[PDB]
Design a binder for these strands. Structure first.
Ligand SMILES: [Mg+2]
Ligand SMILES: [Mg+2]
Ligand SMILES: [Mg+2]
Ligand SMILES: [Mg+2]
Ligand SMILES: [Mg+2]
Ligand SMILES: [Mg+2]
Ligand SMILES: [Mg+2]
Ligand SMILES: [Mg+2]
Ligand SMILES: [Mg+2]
Ligand SMILES: [Mg+2]
Ligand SMILES: [Mg+2]
Lengths: 205, 293, 159, 50, 170
RNA sequence: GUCUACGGCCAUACCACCCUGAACGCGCCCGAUCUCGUCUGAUCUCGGAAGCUAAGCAGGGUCGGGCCUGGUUAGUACUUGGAUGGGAGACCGCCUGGGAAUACCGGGUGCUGUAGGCUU
RNA sequence: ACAGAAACCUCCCGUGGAGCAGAAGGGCAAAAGCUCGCUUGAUCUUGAUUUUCAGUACGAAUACAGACCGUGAAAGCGGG
RNA sequence: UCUUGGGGCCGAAACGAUCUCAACCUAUUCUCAAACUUUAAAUGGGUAAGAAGCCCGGCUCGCUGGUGUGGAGCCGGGCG
């Protein structure tokens, strides 16, 4: 139904968002970016692996949907439906056009919206998985399988940050002990030595 | 619940107006037209007569604008009028006239043109404009800066303006806003204006109260009674004030006196003091918590 | 093609800076401009009268005429292979005294004084500027501290 | 030769290949030599070279 | 001892009759206010044309006026009397004002006349302190300051003492 | 130390809340005969001087928000000029020069001109 | 009070999130918006200039200059 | 979270109790813009780097004007 993904692999056009100028864009193939036990607290899943893009290219919303299912099914089978949390880190905002031929030719060749893609840079995280530290093997295998749904080269990388947080795993526990970090569900709020001293009193009372 | 309008972003985008505007003192739409000189006149000063009536005082100043701020050429205050025999009513229309007259004479004395441009020595309350005398220094020209005052007929800024032109200052103006202008006929009654300049409307009120209710008279005119100012003598009180103003309009600055260095408000707490206070507060909070347990 | 509109492409050029909208400070109107002065042209969108054309925004000219509100400026404009001395009328809001020559006038006064003062003292002083010379020989004391050894850091995939 | 390089080479007077000139160094001239960097070989001559 | 310049006072009493339409009724409604207040009231036009209410834009549908000074107390006492000096708690605004309604103006001591009819009306009281007017003046206008504002509790207290009124819950 | 009138720059000056304000001021404040204007002397205008710093206003405070200014981010991202450099490409590295911005961390919190007062 | 999501009155917050004929962009808060009062600078006239540009025309626009005016207390503003 | 709803749910029944899911609000969080932006490069565009300058004394004016003020113009003189 759609052209082979080699036709829209490269970031050749400027970003083309669905806006008030580009009307008629069909809905993206991927509508869910978080799945698994999304409600696990920050402290339940210390491990985090990433699928990191090694190329500057465009991924179709179809391949994001395909990879998500691929990585999600393998985790449900090797860790259980409540043993992980998957977050797809790319959103298909750039719109790809089509100049449909059956005949004007190249006259009036500007194309109609055909789909959506995510523009991914080198070193940019495609999708992330957080789970328990004893499932590190199953995370790598899930992301290794999902690579086959994407064009180009992607690298797997087990992060040093605690879960989906921005704070290193080697010190995350210490910061929570002294109330520099406050769990707020999947993540942690950061407490600076700033602001009204009342907020400090509340945290220490 | 509704969105906090004054959130963090409301302050990141907020643009404060000019300080004097925030204070509600200056009208910059009017100021731009009042003070800005034509560019082909270069450094030629553009003078204006600032009149500001406070709750208790009338300030008359002559100033021109410079880039660093206005320069006050001359200033006359109504609280100076007791030196000339006017003890009370220092914000009424007659006082405004005297203050403006005092401002005019003081300026002309300073430039040495007081003998040349004596203005209307005998007050008639009628349209008077000074004519520059050929072969003499030109008559001083200033414009009236009314400020935020509402310029209806009888506003006291025009009382000070009338006193200033009568002193020999050239100020463009019409009689439409002097007291005595009848809006219906579009005719101006000079005599009604003269009554106000002499405070007869104030004198009439005193009599009208005395004849009607004596108790109200004391409440309204308690300082007139104390200073022994009666309705009949007010007109000659003001006429004498004008002459004394004209006779010697110069200002003898109050002699400054060295005073003991005293501080009447706190200075800023230092970083160390502000830092220690937090440390003391934190120690106090935990100390209390331990006691409770 | 494009349009020949007078203000095409001035969306940002003539807009006011961030949180600097509103009233124009009156010192902008109190500046004194004289024949021969050098002024930088900068269109201000708050005042739409006497607006310089976009091609003159960011150019510096010379005042030759002064009127009640505006001035006449002789400013070079390049059109294709020639440069034209153009005469524009610009309200004084959209200009400012150029400080490019002030450094020169400061130098002229300093030059003349040194020229005058040195003459009465029978000495030759330098007056002409010079380009920055190569730095002269010098000693670097170690203060008994061995220079810190630096090494390249290992690679790490901090992805 | 690009227009900027071509003008700087004429100012150094190196209008022909394997032409040589002395240049006294300073911020004005060192930055000119940077522009014509792909087109010149230069260095510090010793007394015997002079 | 409280500073005398903190005493609560009635800034103004605002009477409003929204007749809902123009014509004879609205003219009659104007006369009711004039008898009650002794001053000429002013008409208000509809901001927007609303079909459901049968009012067109710029159509006079309401008449109101402001009463200050002693007369505000006299007209306020009449209305409070008809209410038996009882107000619900929700009748007080968070800014220190309150109001109430009157179904028939004939209860306010106005004799009925056949050529006028019967009208209801709203009663609103704006409370304040000295210096509240700095926010209404042309020169150097300012804000009164938090410690000077009137709270909902302050107004209810004022109502209870001033008239011995009763504040019903709910 | 400080205020009043008129200002320049226009938050280091703003916003929220709290404390303190000698003197003179600036105010709030008391009235509506006159000038003037209102449905309303509320505002505007006019005539005053019983009271009060309650508020405005001034100074100070807040591990205050903002704002100003540095540090880090980082010689990173980006970039001028170069090669018969790499790679199927996408792109990337190096040579010669220039060189950012968040988050995060710290410091600061109006200066000042003219004229005129108060403060032994 | 009727009165309700929506009628009208009151207080508070409100940096413009409105409005300024229209497309959009810019500009604007004691205003350029809204409401009143008076009006015809949308008038007569010679040159210079800018924009497109060939540095031609028109069109449109900018500073002035000379008359008659309007408005305002006035500074001023206005020849759409 | 009651400031509005869907489900429930014990009733005499209410804004009584009870949860529960939503809208809402407050802090965070993932990802973006050719027709967004507080910031903000590199390369780039204009101008200046003197004798047509600088500094003195004087004269003209119907222009501006409190002022023999301002501005411009002109004359003479000195500085390489
Ligand atoms: Mg095929
Ligand atoms: Mg393309
Ligand atoms: Mg005005
Ligand atoms: Mg407060
Ligand atoms: Mg005292
Ligand atoms: Mg009053
Ligand atoms: Mg106090
Ligand atoms: Mg802070
Ligand atoms: Mg201060
Ligand atoms: Mg206006
Ligand atoms: Mg004209």
């Amino acid at each position: 139904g759609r052209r082979p993904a080699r036709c829209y692999r490269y970031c050749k056009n400027k970003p083309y968002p669905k806006s008030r100028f580009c009307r008629g864009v069909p809905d993206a193939k991927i509508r869910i970016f978080d799945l698994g036990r999304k409600k696990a607290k920050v402290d339940e899943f210390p491990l985090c692996g990433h699928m990191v893009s090694d190329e500057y290219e465009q991924l179709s919303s179809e391949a994001l949907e395909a990879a998500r299912i691929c990585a999600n099914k393998y985790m449900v089978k090797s860790c259980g439906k409540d043993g992980f949390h998957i977050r797809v880190r790319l959103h298909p905002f750039h719109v790809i056009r089509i100049n449909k031929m059956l005949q004007t030719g190249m006259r009036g060749a500007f194309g109609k919206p055909q789909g959506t893609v995510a523009r991914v840079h080198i070193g940019q995280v495609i999708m992330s998985i957080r789970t328990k530290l004893q499932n590190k093997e199953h995370v790598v295998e899930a992301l290794r399988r999902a690579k086959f749904k994407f064009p180009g080269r992607q690298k797997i990388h087990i992060s040093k940050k605690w879960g989906f947080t921005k704070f290193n795993a080697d010190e995350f526990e210490d910061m929570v002990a002294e109330k520099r970090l406050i769990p707020d569900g999947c993540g942690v709020k950061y407490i600076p030595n700033r602001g009204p001293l009342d907020k400090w009193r509340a945290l220490h009372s | 619940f509704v969105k906090v309008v004054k959130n963090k972003a409301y302050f990141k985008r907020y643009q404060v107006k000019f300080r004097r505007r925030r204070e509600g003192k200056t009208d910059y739409y009017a100021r731009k037209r009042l003070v800005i000189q034509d560019k082909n006149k270069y450094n030629t000063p553009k003078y204006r007569m600032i009149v500001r009536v406070t709750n208790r005082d009338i300030i008359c100043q002559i100033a021109y604008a410079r880039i660093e701020g206005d320069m006050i050429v001359c200033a006359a205050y109504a609280h100076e009028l007791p030196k000339y025999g006017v003890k009370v009513g220092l914000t009424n229309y007659a006082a405004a006239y005297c203050t403006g007259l005092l401002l005019a004479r003081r300026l002309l004395n300073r430039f040495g043109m007081d003998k040349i441009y004596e203005g209307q020595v005998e007050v008639t309350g009628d349209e008077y404009n000074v004519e520059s005398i050929d072969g003499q220094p030109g008559a001083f020209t200033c414009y009236l800066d009314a400020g935020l005052a509402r310029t209806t007929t009888g506003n006291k800024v025009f009382g000070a303006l009338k006193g200033a032109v009568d002193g020999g200052l050239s100020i463009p103006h019409s009689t439409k806003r002097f007291p005595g202008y009848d809006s219906e006929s579009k005719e101006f009654n000079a005599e009604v204006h003269r009554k106000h300049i002499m405070g007869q409307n104030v004198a009439d009120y005193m009599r009208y109260l005395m004849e009607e209710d004596e108790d109200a008279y004391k409440k309204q005119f308690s300082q007139y009674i104390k200073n022994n100012v009666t309705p009949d003598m007010m007109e000659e009180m003001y006429k004498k004030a004008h002459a004394a103003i004209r006779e010697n309009p110069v200002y003898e600055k109050k002699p400054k006196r060295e005073v003991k260095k005293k501080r009447w408000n706190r200075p800023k707490m230092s970083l160390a003091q502000k830092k220690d206070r937090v440390a003391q507060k934190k120690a106090s909070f935990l100390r209390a918590q331990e006691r409770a347990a | 093609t494009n349009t020949k509109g007078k203000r095409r492409g001035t969306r940002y050029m003539f807009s006011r800076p961030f949180r600097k909208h509103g009233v124009v400070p009156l010192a902008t109107y109190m500046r004194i401009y004289k024949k021969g002065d050098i002024v930088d042209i900068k269109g201000m969108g708050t005042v739409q009268k006497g607006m310089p054309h976009k091609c003159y925004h960011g150019k510096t000219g010379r005042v030759y005429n002064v009127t009640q509100h505006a001035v006449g400026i002789v400013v070079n404009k390049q059109v294709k292979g020639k440069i034209l001395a153009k005469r524009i009328n610009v309200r004084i809001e959209h200009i400012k005294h150029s400080k490019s020559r002030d450094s020169f006038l400061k130098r002229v006064k300093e030059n003349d004084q040194k020229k005058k003062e040195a003459k009465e003292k029978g000495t030759w002083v330098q007056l002409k500027r010079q380009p920055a010379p190569p730095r002269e020989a010098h000693f670097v004391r170690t203060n008994g501290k061995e220079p810190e050894l630096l090494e390249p850091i290992p690679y790490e995939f901090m992805a | 030769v690009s227009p900027k390089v071509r003008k700087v080479l004429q100012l150094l007077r190196l209008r022909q290949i394997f032409n040589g000139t002395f240049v006294k160094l300073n911020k004005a001239s060192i930055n000119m030599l940077r522009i014509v960097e792909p087109y010149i070989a230069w260095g510090y001559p010793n007394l015997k070279s002079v | 001892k409280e500073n005398p310049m903190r005493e609560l006072r009635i800034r103004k009493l605002c009477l409003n009759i929204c007749v809902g339409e123009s014509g004879d009724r609205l003219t009659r409604a104007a006369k009711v206010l004039e008898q009650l207040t002794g001053q000429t009231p002013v008409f208000s036009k509809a901001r927007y044309t609303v079909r459901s209410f049968g009012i067109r834009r710029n159509e006079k549908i309401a008449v109101h006026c402001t009463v200050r000074g002693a007369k505000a107390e006299e007209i306020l006492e009449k209305g409070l009397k008809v209410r038996e000096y009882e107000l619900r708690k929700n009748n007080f605004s968070d800014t220190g004002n309150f109001g109430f309604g009157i179904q028939e103006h004939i209860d306010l001591g106005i004799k009925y006349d056949p050529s006028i009819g019967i009208y209801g009306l709203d009663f609103y009281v704006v409370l304040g302190r000295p210096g509240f007017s700095i926010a209404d003046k042309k020169r150097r206008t300012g804000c009164i300051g938090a410690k000077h504002r009137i709270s909902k509790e302050e107004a209810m207290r004022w109502f209870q003492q001033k008239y011995d009124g009763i504040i019903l819950p709910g």
